[PDB]
Amino acid sequence: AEFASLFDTLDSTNKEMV
Amino acid sequence: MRHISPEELIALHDANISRYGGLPGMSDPGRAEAIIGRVQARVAYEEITDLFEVSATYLVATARGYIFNDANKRTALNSALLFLRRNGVQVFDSPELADLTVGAATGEISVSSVADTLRRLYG
Ligand SMILES: [Br-]
Ligand SMILES: [Br-]
Ligand SMILES: [Br-]
Ligand SMILES: [Br-]
Ligand SMILES: [Br-]
Ligand SMILES: [Br-]
Ligand SMILES: [Br-]
Ligand SMILES: [Br-]
Ligand SMILES: [Br-]
Ligand SMILES: [Br-]
């Protein structure tokens, strides 16, 4: 959950960078 | 201050790969420990208390370190921001983060400069 919340917050940038 | 362990860095990478995609696995066993150990040692030795400088050091070290077959930049970015969040700095997405991370990864943007940007965004 530590990571899921972080990824949620940065979801846009994570997707962009893939 | 609260640091990110090598195994935590790895788990964060692997969760990111699972959620967003990419090639699995580490480039070389031992590199995560070497790089992150180096970061923490340097932070102690140089007496770095500025959270943004420390976050930047994690970001640059992972972005340039090729610990993983894939998602090094993602892991670099998310770990730096995880670091800030654990140390009580609220983080949020910004459309500047992608180019920042790429620039760090290519050696174009220094630790100091990455810290300057993170401090503007989140300080
Ligand atoms: Br996750
Ligand atoms: Br999730
Ligand atoms: Br968050
Ligand atoms: Br993986
Ligand atoms: Br490794
Ligand atoms: Br370092
Ligand atoms: Br990436
Ligand atoms: Br990569
Ligand atoms: Br955004
Ligand atoms: Br540098």
The rounded Å distance from CA B25 to ligand 5 centre is 8
Distance CA B22, CA B104 (A): 20
Experimental technique behind these coordinates: X-ray
Distance CA B44, CA B10 (A): 22
A6, A12, A17: residue with CB nearest B81: A6
For tokens 């699995």, the residue is: B24
Which domains are present in chain B? 1-123 (1.20.120.1870)
End-to-end CA distance of chain A: 22
The dihedral of CA B42, B112, B95, B62: what is its sign?
negative
- The residues, any chain, with a CB within 8 Å of residue B53's CB and separated by 6 or more, are B111, B112, B115
To one decimal, the resolution in angstroms is 1.7
Q: In 3D, which of B28, B29, B34, B40 has the Cα closest to residue B4?
A: B40
Contacts of B91 in chain A (CB under 8 A): 6, 9-10
> What are the helix (H) ranges across B1-123?
6-20, 31-45, 51-65, 72-86, 97-105, 111-122
Residues facing residue B26 across a β-bridge: B68
Distance CA B71, CA B13 (A): 7
List the structure tokens of A13: 């940038």
DSSP letter string over B23-57?
Answer: --SBSSTTHHHHHHHHHHHHHHHTT---HHHHHHH
The rounded Å distance from CA B89 to ligand 3 centre is 10
How many residues does this entry show for chain A?
Answer: 18
